[PDB]
Amino acid sequence: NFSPREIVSELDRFIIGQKDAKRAVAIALRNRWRRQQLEGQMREEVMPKNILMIGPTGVGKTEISRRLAKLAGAPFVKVEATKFTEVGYVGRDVEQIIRDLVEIAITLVREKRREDQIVQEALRVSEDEGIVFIDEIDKIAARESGAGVSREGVQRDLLPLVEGTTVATKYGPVKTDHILFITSGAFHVSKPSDLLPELQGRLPIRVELSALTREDFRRILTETEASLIKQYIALMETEEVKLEFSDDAIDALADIAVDLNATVENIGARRLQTVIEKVLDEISFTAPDKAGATFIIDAAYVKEG
Amino acid sequence: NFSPREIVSELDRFIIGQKDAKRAVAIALRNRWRRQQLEGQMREEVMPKNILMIGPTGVGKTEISRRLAKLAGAPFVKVEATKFTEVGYVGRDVEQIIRDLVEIAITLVREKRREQDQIVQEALRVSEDEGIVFIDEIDKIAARESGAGVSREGVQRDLLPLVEGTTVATKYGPVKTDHILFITSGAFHVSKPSDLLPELQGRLPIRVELSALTREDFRRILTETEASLIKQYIALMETEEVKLEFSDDAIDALADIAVDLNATVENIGARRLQTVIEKVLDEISFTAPDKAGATFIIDAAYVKEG
Amino acid sequence: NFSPREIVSELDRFIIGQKDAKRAVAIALRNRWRRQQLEGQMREEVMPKNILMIGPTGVGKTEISRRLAKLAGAPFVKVEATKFTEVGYVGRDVEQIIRDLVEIAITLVREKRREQDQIVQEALRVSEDEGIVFIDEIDKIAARESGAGVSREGVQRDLLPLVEGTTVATKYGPVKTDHILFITSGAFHVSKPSDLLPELQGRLPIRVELSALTREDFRRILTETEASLIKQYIALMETEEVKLEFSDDAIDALADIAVDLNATVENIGARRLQTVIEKVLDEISFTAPDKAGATFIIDAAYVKEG
Amino acid sequence: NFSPREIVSELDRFIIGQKDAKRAVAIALRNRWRRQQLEGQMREEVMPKNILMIGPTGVGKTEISRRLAKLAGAPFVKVEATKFTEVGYVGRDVEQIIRDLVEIAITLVREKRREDQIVQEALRVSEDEGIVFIDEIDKIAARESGAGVSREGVQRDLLPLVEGTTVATKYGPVKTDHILFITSGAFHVSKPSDLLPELQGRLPIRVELSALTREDFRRILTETEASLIKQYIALMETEEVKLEFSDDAIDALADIAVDLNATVENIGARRLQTVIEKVLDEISFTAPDKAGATFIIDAAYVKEG
């Protein structure tokens, strides 16, 4: 899809809630289209509407950006900002981000072409369509454990990428002027105004994300297209086992994850994956011994499990 | 074998006990087969059932994973997590794990084809769909922070791209880690599993404990498994025309020596057995060619003098 | 007051909301009274119901504890835990907390007696049975390890003797900390409560959360409580013969300014209110003596220009 | 009591299980009596049978030693060994242990005398009867976060105390030749043979302690004389509330603590204190409003709580 409301709808198929974050990337992606519709010098003066996402861990910041890029057939790279503060001879320079992105556009163009010029198209796509997700940008803006580049230095090193620079790769120079950047952080260890002024100026769009509620966990489990329940159901189908979850079993699974997030650590929706798996441990092991049968998991089964 | 109960049975041929750990890797391996039966988009949405093994040292964490990979003809790489906290210019980046794995899948595909650009293409296919990566002492890179290189949390952060899904460059071409299985292990005395990065927890769906080995476990480790130390020394002395025999009380005596050393010096698990049988066999290992055709019996008394 | 519901009601006079936190300190204080009703050995086996408060900054953690201590005529000491991680030769040891507490109990007993070796003896008695110690940012000394003094875990380890029970030397004599109540607080974004030393967890029986303050909370904080900022500025301007008046829309406007600043710069909780009323009162605070006998009304429009 | 079997019995009133650890301190305390029964120079050649306790956290190492000393009317000091590895101008020298011990013997002699000579008796008791508990002695024997004395240096600093030295205090010199030392550690970060040889030689008795079982938690809750249940029952009696626990409620409370120790962290019996308190939160708050009544807590009440 190509329209912002259409983009929001496509993202609804995989991400529950977070409407503001969904609309922010839609605007950013739609503006890339508006730029290419422009003609003349104005085509070279408009820059990507880069985004700063603020929100707790495991509530959809990566997922929204990752699905967005797949929607737009754009090459995507996720990186943890603090990795550039560590010593190391391999992969400690931020231009590795751009080199990896071309490496992802090559393997992306090969898939579409099948269905020298290919390498050129990977270099064309990377410049005009690349999407870069920089996680925990809040951690490189704090009051200063890494013995490498300082935190402000990682910010200073990010400036050439998001302002516009040329980067050398094993396939040739890559310009970053019109690559879209999505940055994210919780901003408990720092605040958004602790970013370098030059970085603030290259983050036009600011959007918050909210904690997931108990109802959010229920819908995340069942409603989205690649949901965990649909995965476990699909995996047991290959063993000739029709797996069924009652509605109270789904409520019970969501409650286990909410409670653990409330007593151990709130890791957001990442808790769901580990909770369903232990409840399905007995049936995942014995599934070939149960072929042809229909297995219904109720609230009581989740309780004993 | 391809079935979880069948996998557990194959592992019983080499590992004593640790039934929960055996069933955990079976589930993880069986899900790889369940995934490839899927067709469509769901084939690209299911991720490996990575495992966190919790247990003391030398009770079968590496051995289970290593036998599992050989059972599945899958390329296998074991790595010590804390090695990435040290300074150095060779092999200090976690992508070295993935490069080594292709290096092991290439040499694996050549063996089966014989019994080539196309071989390298499948070695890149095998590595992506069948690779198994064992990360030891993942508990030590989650502690309260001697390595002067990457910090402990930084080694975790560097592991995130591998287990979440990334493309890695090699001397043979780009490799995706999306469908590689990861088995991680630690004792978790210096830290706890919730000290791992949240992003890491979410990519470790299966959690399994392992237990200390008991005195009876040592006796069965010595004799019952297919590649047991006793069966090795017997086979080694057969090449010298010497029938090496252990009485049943001798095996008990050897197990008791190892338990006591693990109880008074340090508990290193079943690794103590190797050094204990070897010192008792010192006299015969030296003189065996001078003793050809003869039968050498090690009893409880011989273990005592040894 | 002496009853938990009565304690909650007394705290309602100064703190808006945070009902769970109010009831938590009530239980802890009521158990002190329950203990002294006991006679015999059980009188020496019951230990204070120490509290861990979890909540964002500036929502009432210090204020609740501080009002509680004044309600109970108990000596009170607030300390920043991370101060003990810094180098220095004055006041860098945790026993300084206890020495300061006696210093506050002495000056407390003198006030009540007037309205002396015997005073110091009871100040040493009061400190032991009635002292209240508030330790802020106990979450920061439980993180992954800028202070060049004691390490973070070391500050925890140094706190163990205080909350488990120890004798501390002072310029007035030995003081036991066995029956001192401890209230600890943190946001727990940089760490989690299970990152505390096991020995510390066991001496924190009561766990209570506090919530963010809402826009309506700011309005009630401004006006409803007994020592509210509005009642302070009104009283301060009364000494100049100026009737200071706030309309209800003006109070909403002031609360909105603070919410927006907490939403765009940094969320510092109710601390934002103090700086916001002060800038709106800048014009009148200066000219009030030149305006004696007059009435000054601050409306929504006046807050807008200000 | 004065006999080792009698000592073991007195400790049974407060500590569940750990029979080996109980007998080890009994031997050590009984030998102090055997020494004072000796006459002549042999009286000056026998040294305390110091103990190294090995065991997990929160299973009774401190409690056994603390109760033992109270049984013997002996002044007692507990210290965390790693505290001497930290920088600091106050209380970072191991002789503070001995100075604190005299400070505890003074306040101990005043209690018994009531029921210059007193200070002399505090100096007499400290030398002949002091008991020093050094916790986590395993942590100062590891492979080397404190920026002060090194770990081996803390061991080296402990040598004068346990071999025999004179220590100056605000009341006068204190000899440590016949002070009993109980040291403890889990020995996962190191092993007992990592201690300095001179320290090994001054730790004659070696005793292990075991993890607490589910049944241990049940007996710890109810059976011992100062148990948590008897405290909460006694505290509610001062409010005219007869609090009663069913047997299944006690089982339920023990199960909550075992599960948390199995999923968060095994902190031993320290988990019990925090678990009963949250279950009693509603009644502890409302107890004055319920005076004259009898309140029975069953398994179902522990479940909702």
Ligand SMILES: Nc1ncnc2c1ncn2[C@@H]1O[C@H](COP(=O)(O)OP(=O)(O)O)[C@@H](O)[C@H]1O
């Ligand atoms: N709102 C949500 N809707 C659907 N899935 C979600 C949501 N929030 C988190 N998830 C899932 O939880 C996991 C972690 O989420 P992710 O977006 O990567 O985290 P973060 O916000 O920390 O980047 C992924 O499997 C993701 O699909």
Ligand SMILES: Nc1ncnc2c1ncn2[C@@H]1O[C@H](COP(=O)(O)OP(=O)(O)O)[C@@H](O)[C@H]1O
């Ligand atoms: N349960 C067991 N059954 C059989 N052999 C075992 C067992 N535990 C340990 N061993 C043997 O002891 C040695 C060390 O075991 P290993 O699994 O590699 O240790 P770790 O669990 O620390 O990874 C190997 O020779 C292994 O075969």
Ligand SMILES: Nc1ncnc2c1ncn2[C@@H]1O[C@H](COP(=O)(O)OP(=O)(O)O)[C@@H](O)[C@H]1O
């Ligand atoms: N809920 C509240 N009710 C009343 N005053 C409050 C509330 N929260 C904060 N305040 C006021 O805001 C300031 C800071 O609050 P305080 O409790 O000291 O912060 P913290 O919770 O960080 O300890 C004080 O002036 C306090 O009176």
Ligand SMILES: Nc1ncnc2c1ncn2[C@@H]1O[C@H](COP(=O)(O)OP(=O)(O)O)[C@@H](O)[C@H]1O
């Ligand atoms: N076996 C036990 N019997 C009775 N109480 C115990 C036992 N183990 C631990 N406790 C209690 O748990 C808490 C911590 O125990 P403690 O002996 O101080 O720990 P450690 O072994 O770490 O020194 C104390 O309240 C203690 O009374």
